Amino acid sequence: ATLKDQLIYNLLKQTPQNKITVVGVGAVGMACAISILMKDLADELALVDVIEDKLKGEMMDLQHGSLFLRTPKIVSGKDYNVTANSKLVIITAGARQQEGESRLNLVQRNVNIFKFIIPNVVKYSPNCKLLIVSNPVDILTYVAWKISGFPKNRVIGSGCNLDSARFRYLMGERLGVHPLSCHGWVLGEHGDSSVPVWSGMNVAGVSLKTLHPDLGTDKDKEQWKEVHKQVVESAYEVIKLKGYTSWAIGLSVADLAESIMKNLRRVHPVSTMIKGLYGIKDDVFLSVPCILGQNGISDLVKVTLTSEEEARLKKSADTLWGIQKELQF
Amino acid sequence: ATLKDQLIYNLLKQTPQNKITVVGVGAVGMACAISILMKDLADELALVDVIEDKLKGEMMDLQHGSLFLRTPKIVSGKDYNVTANSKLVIITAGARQQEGESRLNLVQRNVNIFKFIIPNVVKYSPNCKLLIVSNPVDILTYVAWKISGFPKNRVIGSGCNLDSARFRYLMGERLGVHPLSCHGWVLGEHGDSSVPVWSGMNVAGVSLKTLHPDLGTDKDKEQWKEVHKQVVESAYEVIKLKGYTSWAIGLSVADLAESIMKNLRRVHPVSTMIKGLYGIKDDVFLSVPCILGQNGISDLVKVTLTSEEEARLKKSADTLWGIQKELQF
Amino acid sequence: ATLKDQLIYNLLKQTPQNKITVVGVGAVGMACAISILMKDLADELALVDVIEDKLKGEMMDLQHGSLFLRTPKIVSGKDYNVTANSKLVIITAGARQQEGESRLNLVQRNVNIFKFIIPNVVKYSPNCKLLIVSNPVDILTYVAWKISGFPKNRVIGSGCNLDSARFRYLMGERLGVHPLSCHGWVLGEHGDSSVPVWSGMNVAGVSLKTLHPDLGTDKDKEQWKEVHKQVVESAYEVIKLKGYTSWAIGLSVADLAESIMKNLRRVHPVSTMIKGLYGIKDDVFLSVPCILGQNGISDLVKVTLTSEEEARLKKSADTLWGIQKELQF
Amino acid sequence: ATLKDQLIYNLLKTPQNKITVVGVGAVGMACAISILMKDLADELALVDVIEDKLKGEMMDLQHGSLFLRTPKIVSGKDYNVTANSKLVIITAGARQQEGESRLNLVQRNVNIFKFIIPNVVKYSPNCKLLIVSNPVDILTYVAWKISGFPKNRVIGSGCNLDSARFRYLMGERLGVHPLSCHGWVLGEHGDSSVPVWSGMNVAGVSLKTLHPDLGTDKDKEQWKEVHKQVVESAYEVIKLKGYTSWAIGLSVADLAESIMKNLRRVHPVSTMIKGLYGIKDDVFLSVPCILGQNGISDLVKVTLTSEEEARLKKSADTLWGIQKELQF
Numbered sequence A, B, C: 001a002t003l004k005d006q007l008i009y010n011l012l013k014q015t016p017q018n019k020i021t022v023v024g025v026g027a028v029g030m031a032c033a034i035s036i037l038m039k040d041l042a043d044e045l046a047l048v049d050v051i052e053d054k055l056k057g058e059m060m061d062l063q064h065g066s067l068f069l070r071t072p073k074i075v076s077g078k079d080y081n082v083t084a085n086s087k088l089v090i091i092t093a094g095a096r097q098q099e100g101e102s103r104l105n106l107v108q109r110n111v112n113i114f115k116f117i118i119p120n121v122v123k124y125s126p127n128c129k130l131l132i133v134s135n136p137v138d139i140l141t142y143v144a145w146k147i148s149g150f151p152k153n154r155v156i157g158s159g160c161n162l163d164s165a166r167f168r169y170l171m172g173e174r175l176g177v178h179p180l181s182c183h184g185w186v187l188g189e190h191g192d193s194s195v196p197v198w199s200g201m202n203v204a205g206v207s208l209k210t211l212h213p214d215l216g217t218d219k220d221k222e223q224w225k226e227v228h229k230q231v232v233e234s235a236y237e238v239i240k241l242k243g244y245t246s247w248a249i250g251l252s253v254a255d256l257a258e259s260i261m262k263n264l265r266r267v268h269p270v271s272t273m274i275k276g277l278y279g280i281k282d283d284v285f286l287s288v289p290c291i292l293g294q295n296g297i298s299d300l301v302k303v304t305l306t307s308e309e310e311a312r313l314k315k316s317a318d319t320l321w322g323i324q325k326e327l328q329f
Numbered sequence D: 001a002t003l004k005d006q007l008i009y010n011l012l013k014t015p016q017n018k019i020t021v022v023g024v025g026a027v028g029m030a031c032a033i034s035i036l037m038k039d040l041a042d043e044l045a046l047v048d049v050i051e052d053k054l055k056g057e058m059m060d061l062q063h064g065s066l067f068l069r070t071p072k073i074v075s076g077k078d079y080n081v082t083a084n085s086k087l088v089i090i091t092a093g094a095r096q097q098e099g100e101s102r103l104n105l106v107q108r109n110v111n112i113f114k115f116i117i118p119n120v121v122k123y124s125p126n127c128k129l130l131i132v133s134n135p136v137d138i139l140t141y142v143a144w145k146i147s148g149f150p151k152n153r154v155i156g157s158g159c160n161l162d163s164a165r166f167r168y169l170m171g172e173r174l175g176v177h178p179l180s181c182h183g184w185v186l187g188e189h190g191d192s193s194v195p196v197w198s199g200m201n202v203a204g205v206s207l208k209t210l211h212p213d214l215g216t217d218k219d220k221e222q223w224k225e226v227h228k229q230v231v232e233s234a235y236e237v238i239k240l241k242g243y244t245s246w247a248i249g250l251s252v253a254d255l256a257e258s259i260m261k262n263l264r265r266v267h268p269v270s271t272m273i274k275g276l277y278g279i280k281d282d283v284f285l286s287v288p289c290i291l292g293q294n295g296i297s298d299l300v301k302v303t304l305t306s307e308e309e310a311r312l313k314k315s316a317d318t319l320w321g322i323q324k325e326l327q328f
């Protein structure tokens, strides 16, 4: 008898029920991981990346904190077999923006990495929801959908969940109210062509645009457009300051994971196919409000846009589609 | 009138009530910050460091995630006025040991950095608890205590809380039991010379040493002593693989912050001024199990140690004192 | 020496920092208590009531679950000295209406009861926020205000926070969307005479009244008016089925406590002094959206109401003032 | 089209972490609220025979949905509402009346469980059963016999609460949080439970080694009275408020957390103990068990003194003396 066999009588000689994989152990990947771990969303966490040392080191560092977590198994490996049986696979790997660089400048590189990553994910977790975080997220969500063969409910991009969170933060600062009570939606591209939906902004269901008709216009004496300009510029400013962004996106992704894993059916602005709305007929992916739960995106909310908002959203779709349409698979 | 005044009728025109400061926004400081944020331990978090762009970028990145948090105020700056009225001030800043640098010279460089940091902390939060996380932690805890002029109860080193968490992770992995139910205490000097207290190692109050009398000796067929060696060497391996450790330390610190901020009077093995115990006769800080609460360390547990355990604590104390006695304050 | 002194060396020989008191240990009082305990809002919980057996039993039962909580001190007694230094005191005690007793006489009995409770609360926690949960809440919040001598930011009635949560539950059931994503506000007097603000009802900032102009009217083929009718009748139905309500009130009250204790500045529809809105000239308390934080109600939202909505609030205000002016303090 | 169709464009048409609570008395509802506030389930079902009370409790919980993260709460007298539960927690049954023998009380619960348990098994054949009804060690056996489940899926709440109470009282005496005051109460829940003095420790320091009289009648400090108070505390609460609820609910939610999240923490729960401590009969008593996704996967074999071991054997004999008389 070993010490274990003297101490413990074994009765039972099972897959995880709530496994999540994070692909990519860069700063974004690891912020997603710690955020998911601290939210108790998974019974198993797997990490995958191509840099073996860094991957192992990250895994071990999380494991050493196990005592303080409620996720009893953390694994990693360059081989996708460690990701088998995931309910949710979060893809953060690939090139990221350098100072001053457009997320759209990342397309060729990250499409080529997705050509390797997505078939491997799909092979080991054929029923997962895919949550794409890598940039440009809207384009890569389309790509992941096309490569995976998944129905589109199961391919979700982090999209404008973060842009909307930034927007509500800044709104909150101007009004003196917690972001949880400042409502406003940013839709379209997670990037420079995003669309603030001024007509929907409210606190306690009081329309800000009804109170302030010039809201969001160039004529606005309070220059509320500058809030959206700051939303657009946020990642660039943070990158210039600390080299990359990580915490906000990690929190946003864990917010999405929470709705998925706990089947909440909360609404979030995430990247999905919008064909059929606003007279768009192209297979373009961008953010609109979607109901998120255990089957991914189960429904879209049809937002009532002003003609100016709709035009902006159409411009966003045209910019994204002009890229997506030329991709070769 | 402004949109704000049209929307909102002000009744009242702020002293922080549950504030935590983190000094140093390297990987350790930010892991402490995110862990504290995700455990809802503070109503205000202040970040301070000397590199202003990086500091602002970290702050902004955390603020952009505010929607997903319950800590409504996040501030930063090089000026310690941002830290005023902290209940708890966590010090992670300092110099890293260079190739060829003696331990004595490294500590002296950290003394010189502490002579700027500590009096600034003390000026703005004179009644805080100081929690030192910078390496080498036991010596820098002494440094902070001497410079601050604080009573012993309010100067705490992170010490062996992380070593014991690592130990319990490794134990759990061996026994197939969650670390929460695998008990064991690593005491003394953090890291290389720490002491595993084999007599206290247990599951459900069943003493493993009693069940397996070779436990923790060279001759043990199951080489349980390897578990402690792995705790010591775990860090080395993580450093060699990813460059540094961060996540486990962050979670360890947030565990300590939880007991302090919530006045839990849980017991943790943290570094405290131990002159008076164990035949220790110098002003050194070593980990023993301490009751932690709103006044810092209020009580400590007198662990019964074997002759060999006691000798190893004394050797550490002599070694620490041997460096401390050479420092220029 | 004793066992404790052999085990523990004492360093220091305590004011609670985040203490909450619940007055009244009926079902509502105890549901507030468990809800607060399970949200880790307090470092000390005090219970007070006049029925000494039941009070001690409730206290002990909660104490027996301390292992599973993070509120290290739970106390109780008939004497208000156990309430000292509370940040928040939650009042759930009050009269039951008698057959044939006028609403005026009933409120007068609560005045006389509050003339005992409130000055004893004020003696031991002069700087607390008072949260009145007792029915009829709007008038009892006025009574507490008048007896306490507190400024009006520190006297808060639970008001329509529950009514709005019910409304959102029912909305979410009809739409297949989590109530967190179904926005809508019920204002004015809690319960029978509450006002649903149809203009504010929305998902992702999309106004349902705009999409469906008959919303809230008797002309509506979908009878959305029945949602509010169910909000009003809900307590009646739950009372007929189980004898009383408790759980929802507890959870609602814990939501309010969270904003106050953590200084969140979230907006909640709670009872506050609304003299000067809506052509109301009297010292009456009714629910409007209020910003809640560490100083209680700091601000209120001026909701644009329809002529009918406004007239309903004014009518509640007139009825309340008709009673209040005949009370003897 | 309908408002709902004008607002929402539908793309898509089984709960994955579902819990059922059987019985909506004080204990059942305390379990329900504790489970809801710990976010352990994506669906909660409630079942009892008293339909008004059941519906009222369901609605009162539902009205709190905004504040919870359990998006579906259902109830009914028909066990079809409990389909596909991972964990079914049984709190229903008869309470012992004036003049009633233990045997007859148990039989009355056998007759109730003959309805409840097969209904549970029909709709959630792969669930774990957690028996909370009193006397728990015997009714766990009853549930096991009626269900036909393997031993690992039939768990009694057992001494998890006794142990929590003991650590509360130990903590009060020492001025340390219960989380840092370790000690295990085993065997039969309640009156005949056994405090294992040898495992009582703070930070791995054995109190018994420091204080050899610990747990003996000789003890100047009367530490035996801490265990007496564990037994008597319940009687006291019952005398004061009429019943106990909150602590049972928190204890049961602690067990459910380990099961639902596959934590493999160790808890002292009621499990079939035949083959230990000289016990040869099919009886359930509390020992420390590893709890996870498949129920009880492993038992910790605590080293007991002869006296402690005799007390469990006596309990086993008494339990078996009752069980052999029951009519299934």
Ligand SMILES: O=C(O)c1csc(-n2nc(-c3ccc(F)c(F)c3)cc2O)n1
Binding pocket: B096, B097, B102, B103, B106, B107, B135, B136, B162, B190, B191, B192, B235, B245, B249
């Ligand atoms: O994760 C850890 O456990 C960790 C990370 S760094 C770390 N260190 N660092 C020293 C250290 C640092 C500078 C010195 F001059 C020195 F002599 C030692 C000791 C540790 O135990 N330990």
Ligand SMILES: O=C(O)c1csc(-n2nc(-c3ccc(F)c(F)c3)cc2O)n1
Binding pocket: C095, C096, C097, C106, C135, C136, C190, C191, C192, C235, C244, C245, C249
């Ligand atoms: O859940 C609820 O919404 C609820 C439970 S009781 C409840 N009440 N209770 C009164 C009430 C209670 C005693 C009185 F003397 C009285 F004049 C009114 C009004 C409510 O709206 N409302």
Ligand SMILES: O=C(O)c1csc(-n2nc(-c3ccc(F)c(F)c3)cc2O)n1
Binding pocket: D095, D096, D101, D102, D105, D106, D134, D135, D161, D189, D190, D191, D234, D244, D248
């Ligand atoms: O909170 C508790 O700890 C508690 C509440 S009831 C409770 N009981 N109930 C019995 C019990 C019930 C019926 C019987 F026929 C019998 F012989 C014993 C034993 C407990 O230990 N214990």
Ligand SMILES: [Zn+2]
Binding pocket: A180, C180
């Ligand atoms: Zn919200």
Ligand SMILES: [Zn+2]
Binding pocket: B180, D179
């Ligand atoms: Zn523990």
Ligand SMILES: [Zn+2]
Binding pocket: B190, B191, B192, B235
């Ligand atoms: Zn180290």
Ligand SMILES: [Zn+2]
Binding pocket: C135, C190, C191, C192, C235
């Ligand atoms: Zn009511």
Ligand SMILES: [Zn+2]
Binding pocket: D189, D190, D191, D234
């Ligand atoms: Zn009992």
